[PDB]
Design a protein around this ligand. Structure first.
Ligand SMILES: *[C@@H]1O[C@H](CO)[C@@H](O)[C@H](O)[C@H]1NC(C)=O
Ligand SMILES: *[C@@H]1O[C@H](CO)[C@@H](O)[C@H](O)[C@H]1NC(C)=O
Ligand SMILES: *[C@@H]1O[C@H](CO)[C@@H](O)[C@H](O)[C@H]1NC(C)=O
Lengths: 53, 107, 168, 105, 125, 168, 168, 105, 125, 105
């Protein structure tokens, strides 16, 4: 359904918050959208190694 | 009396993959991949054209059963049904139809 | 790190790197504020550089071709698939290499803190091996605060630690 | 630790671009916080980490600087800006507040 | 979503203890953040009095560390301040605040992000 | 490494990093097994990540155009040449940077082994400079095996090494 | 570096890394020639590899389409914009990462020089903390030249430094 | 070094997914080896490095685990699998074998 | 492409030396890999006896180290085991095997990849 | 520091590819310099850093080598090449020149 929401990109299933560089929702997008990749997850570590006693 | 140097540990179980190892438990992690959508057709600066039961061929030709949505002014993109039931009511071939769809995709 | 300091701390919630002093007045899990804010600034810069360097223009990546223009369709498919391959390979390799770099960065921060503390305690303390330093004198809360601050005066405790060191 | 904030008092018309400067005795942090206290009420944090804007804070407030000197800037002044502004810093296990800067239209 | 409410006697005789209590709603004070007391004399800058961690760790202002004591109630959300030996210079507005900001999974005690309302303590007879 | 340990060993065929003990019972080229398997696991992961992250779909990169469609031919040629340029530049730079990283990785492994041995031998041995440690006591095969294993007991030989240290 | 050696030198114009000796004969800002030419060779190789690995063929990236071929025009625009995006992102990230690597390289060179000097002066000198070493003997110009050269003979000054060390 | 392998004896019908567990006293290696010895014959290595398959070995055999515990798994059992399975580890200069696990249809 | 064949006396009197010889074809035993002896008592797990490197380095089982000796023939492909002071507990199947796997240009002695046939040594009279 | 340049004297026809070898006593530099001195005139640097060509120098001159041995090569000889060629090295605070080589048509 069409809503009055605002977005930068648009996927044929629903808009995307284009704050991240990559996306795997759909290849065919419209508007300035993140780059499509064939990965299931791209986690970038920010903390350190978790080794509790 | 002793003073010891150490580092932070918490109760998280997030895992990350480096180049020399796999499945490393980390204190925090940030997702660089967006894998979700809101399920709604939002506005791309402007509101997209909403054809509903019609196609571009039926809308631009003025389908008799499509007269409701002929008031929309400039838009941002076109939204169409996957298989529009109401296109060219009279059978025929639309010349350069995929070119017209590209011309009219945003006015 | 996972070498000479093999265990993390759960009771230190302030910062990423810190201290732990045992004393006649009490124990506690202090934090080294300068190092953890420097690390936070570095990681913030790293994440923002990875994310914000991607400037993209308005594009529609979908095209429609009829049944007599399949060379065009395959050329467009080749373009799309090549871009996807390049971006996927680059993103995965970049994430792996940057995770390695970040873990090495935290390793370097911990080791630099260790050597920073070791330099001040020339021979007024002895290394134990887990990452710890046992004093030859009585380091009260003022002395411990000086050690964590970076203004530990070696000559003040030099002879008091020297007699203890030569005792054993 | 000593914190000096200037100017102590300020008067400026609506629309003026105002700037308050805070200086810290020791530069072991690149971070400072700004509070806006109106008379009879509790302070309200506006800037933290010397640059970050608190949620719900108008965008005209901004922070900058590092090392020993930090600045709080208001671009388009408003009649509701009459309050006392404080600069604060947490260094080791101590929170030090700077003397206020009264702002009047 | 965090609400802090102070409560205590507005009039305290000199050379007697001084008890205040802050109750918290919308948050658990034995779980996540840090909780502090801040006082402000009339016509002066705010002064940090003390802080208690969610782990039960207390850090006091060095000038007031000897006469101050911050306690927590691990049954209901309450933390209390017990400032002893109260002179006329203690007459001030008292505030309870939540210190702690979470970035990269780490909570830093740098700043007070939410404040109470402020109870005025007057030391007179 | 090529710094304070300037020479490699040809007589050690077991592992990448290891030891060499001279003793009254005989000499030998032992290997540090944990470090070399950790290095082998790391290099295996590195090579497999470089190789296996390249997932490619079924494509034919060749197209045919007649003599009235040269704009299309030049567009296809531009696509192909751009992809080749990107892949060539990325592959060469990646190989160079990863070779540097791998050599630094091996250097770090050797240095970490050196410091790990040095920590156990606090002052029961003296550094020679080439990468070697001369004991102040008699380290038999049991003692050498303990040093290589990681359970070298300093207090057992502490006074015997101390008297030798103070003799000279 | 910006750690235990917190200040750069303006009066040393010969090389990137070097020494500074205070002596009864005079002071001066000498340079360590081997390390600075090794660094210059490394940086030259790095810059030449970054620049010269880009081999490009003869291309014209501009095409012209009429008003009935907008799918072609948008496909060409997509190709051009995708190539620009890839190259911009890769170039910026590469420059950032290589700047970090180069600064770490210079840091490693300075630290390696420091440990190289420290190894020769086992206990004939004491670390001061800024990056400096105070001798227990009289190091004349011959001795200083030997230290900078790498052939500093510890046994020659060993006992003369030992008596001074035990004096205080 | 002590090596414990379980279960000592085991019977299972054809097609059963069987699993044998080996535990090592010291975890200085992430690697373990699996041998299959039939009566009257020499052992035949199946798994090495705790995961790698030897050449000529059927794919149904697999290995996993690390640290102190490793597992050998057979997915689709066959009538020729009746043999004794051994877990072995080389630690410093010593090869330690674990007690076998007899498998019967 | 490597074939190992053992040979020795199947009957050995007690308190006398015990000599076996393994001959190798398809490989050079003074060049590349490691060569080991493994014994198995009836109804027990295999036991590693010793190993000789292609460089002439010998490593023995600590329990059997005192009375074992592994030698090599640098003329033809043969390596021999000399187990002394033999009791009834030595009656077992003996195997000669090739230890060593090459990864990243490094040969590791971890496992025995090729085995002999197995000669049964019985200690009786 | 001792520097040996070989061969001491050389005669070669026009178009000959000539090569001069310089050896240094200590290999603390990968760099060497080549000068061409014609009679009655000052030397003129041709090669520095053991490979770099000085500005204004014809391309036929080239330099190579490293460590202890360096080489100067002239591909297409010219009648104006009759001069003395010197190899020089700066090691710590000393410039050492090698004995020349005379080139004749
Ligand atoms: C702590 O360090 C600061 C920063 O340099 C210094 O100015 C101050 O004197 C030190 N104070 C104490 C009490 O250690
Ligand atoms: C060798 O190290 C291992 C691993 O921790 C330990 O269990 C064992 O006691 C040590 N043994 C010897 C003989 O050094
Ligand atoms: C300086 O170092 C060089 C290079 O190894 C060495 O040959 C020479 O003997 C040393 N000379 C002096 C005077 O230190």
């Amino acid at each position: 359904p069409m809503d009055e929401c605002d977005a930068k990109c648009q996927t044929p299933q629903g808009a995307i918050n284009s704050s991240l560089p990559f996306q795997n929702v759909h290849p065919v997008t419209i508007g300035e959208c993140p780059k499509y990749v064939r990965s299931a997850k791209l986690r970038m570590v920010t903390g350190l190694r978790n080794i509790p006693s | 009396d002793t003073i010891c140097i150490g580092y932070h540990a918490n109760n998280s179980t997030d895992t990350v993959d480096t180049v020399l190892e796999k499945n490393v438990t980390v204190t925090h992690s940030v997702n660089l991949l967006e894998d979700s959508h809101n399920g709604k057709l939002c506005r791309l600066g402007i509101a997209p054209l909403q054809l509903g039961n019609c196609s571009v061929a039926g809308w631009i030709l003025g389908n008799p059963e499509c007269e409701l949505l002929i008031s929309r002014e400039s838009w941002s993109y076109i939204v169409e049904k996957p298989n529009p039931e109401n296109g060219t009511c009279y059978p025929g071939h639309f010349a350069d139809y995929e070119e017209l769809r590209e011309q009219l995709s945003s006015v | 790190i996972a070498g000479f300091i093999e265990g993390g701390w759960t009771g230190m919630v302030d910062g990423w790197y810190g201290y732990h002093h045992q004393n006649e007045q009490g124990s506690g899990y202090a934090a080294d504020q300068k190092s953890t804010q420097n690390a936070i600034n570095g990681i913030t810069n790293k994440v923002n550089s990875v994310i914000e360097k991607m400037n993209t223009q308005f594009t529609a990546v979908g095209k429609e071709f009829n049944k007599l223009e399949r060379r065009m369709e395959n050329l467009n498919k080749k373009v799309d698939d090549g871009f996807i391959d390049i971006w996927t390979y680059n993103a995965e390799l970049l994430v792996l290499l940057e995770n390695e770099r970040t873990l090495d960065f935290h390793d370097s921060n911990v080791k630099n803190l260790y050597e920073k503390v070791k330099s001040q305690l020339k021979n007024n303390a002895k290394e134990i091996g887990n990452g710890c330093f046992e004093f030859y004198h009585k380091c009260n809360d003022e002395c411990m605060e000086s050690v964590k601050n970076g203004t530990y005066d070696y000559p003040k405790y030099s002879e008091e630690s020297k007699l203890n060191r030569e005792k054993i | 630790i000593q914190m000096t904030q200037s100017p102590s008092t300020l008067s400026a018309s609506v629309g003026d671009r105002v700037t308050i400067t805070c200086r810290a005795s020791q530069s072991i942090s690149n971070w400072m916080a700004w509070y806006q206290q109106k008379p009879g009420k509790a302070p309200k944090l506006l800037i933290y980490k010397a640059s970050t804007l608190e949620s719900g804070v108008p965008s005209r407030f901004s922070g900058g600087g590092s090392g020993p000197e930090f600045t709080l800037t208001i671009s388009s002044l408003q009649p509701d800006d009459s309050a006392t502004y404080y600069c604060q810093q947490y260094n080791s296990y101590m929170y030090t507040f700077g003397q206020g800067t009264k702002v009047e239209i | 979503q965090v609400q802090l409410q102070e409560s205590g006697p507005g009039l305290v005789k000199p050379s007697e203890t001084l008890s205040l209590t802050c109750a918290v709603s919308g948050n658990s004070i034995s779980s996540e953040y840090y909780w502090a007391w801040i006082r402000q004399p009339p016509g002066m800058p705010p002064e940090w009095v003390g802080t208690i961690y969610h782990t039960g760790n207390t850090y006091y202002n060095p000038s007031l560390k000897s006469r101050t004591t911050i306690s927590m109630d691990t049954s209901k959300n309450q933390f209390s301040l017990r400032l002893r030996s109260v002179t006329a210079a203690d007459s001030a507005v008292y505030y309870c605040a939540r210190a702690g900001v979470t970035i990269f999974g780490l909570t830093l005690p740098n700043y007070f992000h939410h404040w109470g309302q402020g109870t005025l303590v007057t030391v007179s007879s």
